[PDB]
Amino acid sequence: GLFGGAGVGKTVNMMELIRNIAIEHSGYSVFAGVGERTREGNDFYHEMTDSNVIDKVSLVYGQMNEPPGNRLRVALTGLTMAEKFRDEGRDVLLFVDNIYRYTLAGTEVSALLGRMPSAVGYQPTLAEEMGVLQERITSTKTGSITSVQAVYVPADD
Amino acid sequence: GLFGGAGVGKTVNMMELIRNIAIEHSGYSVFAGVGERTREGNDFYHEMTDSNVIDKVSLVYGQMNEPPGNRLRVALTGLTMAEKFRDEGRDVLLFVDNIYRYTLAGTEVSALLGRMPSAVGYQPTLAEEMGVLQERITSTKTGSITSVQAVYVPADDLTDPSPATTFAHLDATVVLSRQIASLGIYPAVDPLDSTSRQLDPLVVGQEHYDTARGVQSILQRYQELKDIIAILGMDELSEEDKLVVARARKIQRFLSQPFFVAEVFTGSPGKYVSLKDTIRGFKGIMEGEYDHLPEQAFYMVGSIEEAVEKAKKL
Amino acid sequence: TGYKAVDSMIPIGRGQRELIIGDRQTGKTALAIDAIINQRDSGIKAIYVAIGQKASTISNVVRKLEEHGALANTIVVVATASESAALQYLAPYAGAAMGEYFRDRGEDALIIYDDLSKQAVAYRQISLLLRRPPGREAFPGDVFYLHSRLLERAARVNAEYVEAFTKGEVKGKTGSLTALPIIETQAGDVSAFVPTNVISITDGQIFLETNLFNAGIRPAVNPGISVSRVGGAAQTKIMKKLSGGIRTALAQYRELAAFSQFASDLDDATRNQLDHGQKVTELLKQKQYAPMSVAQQSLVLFAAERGYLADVELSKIGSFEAALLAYVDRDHAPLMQEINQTGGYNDEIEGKLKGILDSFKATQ
Amino acid sequence: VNPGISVSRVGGAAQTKIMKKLSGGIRTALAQYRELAAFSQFASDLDDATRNQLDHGQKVTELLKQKQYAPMS
Amino acid sequence: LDLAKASATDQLKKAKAEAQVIIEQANKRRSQILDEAKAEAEQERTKIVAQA
Amino acid sequence: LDLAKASATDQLKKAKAEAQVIIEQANKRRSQILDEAKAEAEQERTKIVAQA
Amino acid sequence: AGAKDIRSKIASVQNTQKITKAMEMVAASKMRKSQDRMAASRPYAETMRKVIGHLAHGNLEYKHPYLEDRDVKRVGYLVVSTDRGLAGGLNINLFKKLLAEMKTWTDKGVQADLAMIGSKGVSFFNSVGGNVVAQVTGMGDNPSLSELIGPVKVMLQAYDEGRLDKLYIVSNKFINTMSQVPTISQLLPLPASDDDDLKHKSWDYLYEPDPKALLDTLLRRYVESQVYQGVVENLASEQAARMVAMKAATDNGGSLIKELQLVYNKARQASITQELTEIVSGAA
Ligand SMILES: Nc1ncnc2c1ncn2[C@@H]1O[C@H](COP(=O)(O)OP(=O)(O)OP(=O)(O)O)[C@@H](O)[C@H]1O
Ligand SMILES: Nc1ncnc2c1ncn2[C@@H]1O[C@H](COP(=O)(O)OP(=O)(O)O)[C@@H](O)[C@H]1O
């Protein structure tokens, strides 16, 4: 869990992670995001040049207007990816964007079901999806299945 | 708009409303009863007759027993009739009350209609009715129609779209309240929120405009003081507070006023009260000028002098 | 925007949507009205929308429209008390239609939507009318998508609008779309799933305090309860420069406030925190109708910059003698040409700021 | 944990002459060092009553804590 | 003493009157400015509602 | 010397003081007028544009 | 709670009643030590008057300097004032009656001269205005005659100088433990004790000096230790009603606890109510 406000050099330190997870660590350093600001995402392509090391991680993005399934989709294919990296032994360590997008995302999900959803209509099993989640991320046999844990603050609940 | 449920003096306040109404009446107008106490209509009507007043004014009469179909029924009669008058009499004017009867009727109807009641039961779309009619009314080129009305405040439920939705259509909001009743003021109502949209500090000047702003403050002033005064008693206060609460009991009381119609409800008639004086004494207690007159003399006060005539005697 | 503080709290730029909570019968429509001062003055591309509208408010409103110098600087179609719950939902959809002919024009598109609840319970009496189980308040939860699709559009000027307008006959160019939110509720209730999720989407959130204009202070709003993300980045170098101390008295004054909590607790230092806090509090105001000069930006930077912290410290002399400094502009306001021209921090000016304060001695 | 706010049906019912008998006076005395501490701050000068109690109960109170992975003989 | 307080006195009050005059210059100066403003404004208005 | 000096400074001071006091008062008058005048011009434009 | 409020709140009312209960206790021990201590200061002043007469029968045949106290220009005055809080309202009782007496001197119209002791009425008569040639303040609980010295010969001038004919002397006291005596005196009277000045000193006391000196300074001693006693009793009153008010404030919050009992209890019922409401509604 990552709690901190601003001025992180999170992109800087990410370059230290390039300088680490890519460099000072070998294990395949992947990351992904969703729900950003358009040209500010393009400015994270600018930053992608700042680190320049963007080559470690495919660029796959949500752009939050993406519908709820669209918004909530990318992960398990992400496991078709660590199905390389960790599975590739080059330990999958992939940076993890957005919980509020994911928390609220599963909310909009079980809502759309009209089902008895989780409390306050959230995704009932979203937590079980966390059991599947950490269930995915382990220093593995294959390669350490690792993830940068930082949350779109589910309203910083 | 006239808020308050009935029992609030929504009508009994509306009594003096008929007094000074008459005072200013001087127009071509008509009115009618709805969901009303019967003999109220009987002898009240017999006051119109007593006033010989029914001349310009025909009255349908609804009673508390009425049919809902009757209740909401008299509406379209209002429609066609106004079509007659406001056009015809370019003077058209009326007053009314207790519509929460009608609106409510629509609510019950919704599910009764098998229609989805609105959320928590109203006529599902009933606001459509609301701004439909509030729409449907105008002081017209056809003719200017001055009018006013009440509805039962839903046991004074504000979020009640009766009150909630109501805040929309009305130009100036009113409340017949237990507050000045809790205050025991001759009014027995809650103004403090009421907005006169016509009050422009240009228009008002700062006579009325300024005096008013001082009200907003002093309101917040003694209002605020309520807190810690409650806490420790009021001892901890700087005395200036006591100046505020001073003009609060005093001047606030002074607002409470003789009004001629009081004679009925309050066996004694009070006094018509002119506004220039209101600016005057407004200065006086604003000055705390007298400062001697009891809040009592101020309570139910006549004018500044009348309350100052008090201040001599009282 | 018509308050000096308008900019001062949170400047911005094209592409942005900030919520401002609002107050019933407080002006927060009439305050909300009081906004457009600089906008009609802006004579720049904007839009606004209304549903279920009131013909009186319509009429007198128009009266202001002519009163508003521009009245043509932007257009609005009108939807009244009969505008369909459908149509209610429709206007937000509607704006983009030719709004492109600015945004696509690469011009700033800009819009204003209000009474969005009308679109919501519009979808409610729709949904119950649809006999369709909606979200709470009988309206479907589409507001997410409804304001996903709806809320998406705002596009700050950017040239991967390379097809915007002429496509791109350049027009290779920067589609600017600045969004104008309207946030109000009875009590301003965020528990609305609308106010919840919608609240999230906000690129700024301003709480309006009924308190100031309630006790009457003409500008009423709730600061810091008002929080907008765009901020004084758009405050130009001086506006950038001088804009700092705000939350300070929001602290300090209010911090000074805390001292009262113990009857007779104060300190001369804290007394200075009610001198700046409370007296500098006495400084600020914005009217029922307030324009803002932004050459007034200087007017701001005075109190610290000039001795106006002390100078004419009397609110009598603050309002009065300060207005008499507006005189000193009448006396001397030659360079303000080059100033509002400039709009940026340069000490070279700041000399003229001190000697300005001398004219303020002359201006009392 | 909450001190006797945790309330077991069984308790010293199973406790022995040392345990039941010898070990008795706990929780109320606890409430003491608690309650004895209680007034101390606002109204002050707790005598060696509370000192010699609250602290004695604060001292013994200190002797209470048993870390994770601590069984007790 | 005499020399000092004297000079200070005279220069002081002289300075005083000068100042007062200055205030007057600014007074009907900016004030007259106000009047003229009134006039021009008037013109603009007549124009406006004429246009109406 | 001493009492003299005292009165001299004190005086020329005070004289300056009332002097400016008046000056500001008058200036306030020129303002007051030019205000009233401004109001008048307003009234004029009003009527003109109107019957126009 | 209540909803989020009435209980967080009402609990704050618990912190309240509790807090001010600890106040009742604190200000109680305060009261006990306050009078208990407050009783001490009589002994040598008592002696002073006693003997003062005792000789002063035969001895009184000589001269009285202060028989006028100060000469008549002012009828003087004296102020003591609060170094602390929670005691009571002798700001109102004493400061009220004080302002009153002032009006009586205006009625007289003769001059009057006051001196602040204590902080508060230093700030009353500061605020309320007046003439305090000396201002003393806030010695705390410790009456000290030597502390009084600077004040002692502060006043001793004008009085000795004959400036302030009579004077005004105001001292709180605990009239009972319950009853608290705010007192105010016409000071700079000739205190005029002729009592044991009835019986010619029957033990003919060889007097190393002449009397009138000891009249001045020793008199200062008598009235002074008198002052230590009187202000002490002012402290008796002080911490007494301190404990009192402390208790009552400890009381107030209960009613609130009742109301919040109606928001958490009544709005408890209400929460239950909506629970039923949308329980049904979403439950359809
Ligand atoms: N900045 C302001 N200072 C003082 N009064 C203001 C201000 N803005 C608007 N008002 C006042 O508000 C009144 C109109 O109230 P209005 O109905 O606009 O309140 P409201 O706050 O808009 O309610 P809502 O926002 O729900 O419509 C006008 O009389 C106007 O003077
Ligand atoms: N101005 C007033 N003076 C005295 N009593 C009033 C006034 N206004 C309202 N009331 C009180 O309100 C009570 C209810 O009368 P009614 O008009 O039937 O209330 P409502 O209209 O709310 O039913 C009356 O008994 C009356 O005493």
PDB file of C-alpha atoms in Angstrom, chain C residues 266-275:
ATOM      1  CA  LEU C 266      -6.339  36.614  23.109  1.00  0.00           C
ATOM      2  CA  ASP C 267      -2.728  37.729  22.575  1.00  0.00           C
ATOM      3  CA  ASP C 268      -1.372  40.837  20.911  1.00  0.00           C
ATOM      4  CA  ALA C 269       0.345  38.577  18.412  1.00  0.00           C
ATOM      5  CA  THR C 270      -2.904  36.762  17.787  1.00  0.00           C
ATOM      6  CA  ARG C 271      -4.404  40.227  17.927  1.00  0.00           C
ATOM      7  CA  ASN C 272      -2.261  40.760  14.872  1.00  0.00           C
ATOM      8  CA  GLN C 273      -3.661  37.501  13.555  1.00  0.00           C
ATOM      9  CA  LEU C 274      -7.019  39.201  13.726  1.00  0.00           C
ATOM     10  CA  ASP C 275      -5.371  42.299  12.370  1.00  0.00           C
TER      11      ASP C 275
END
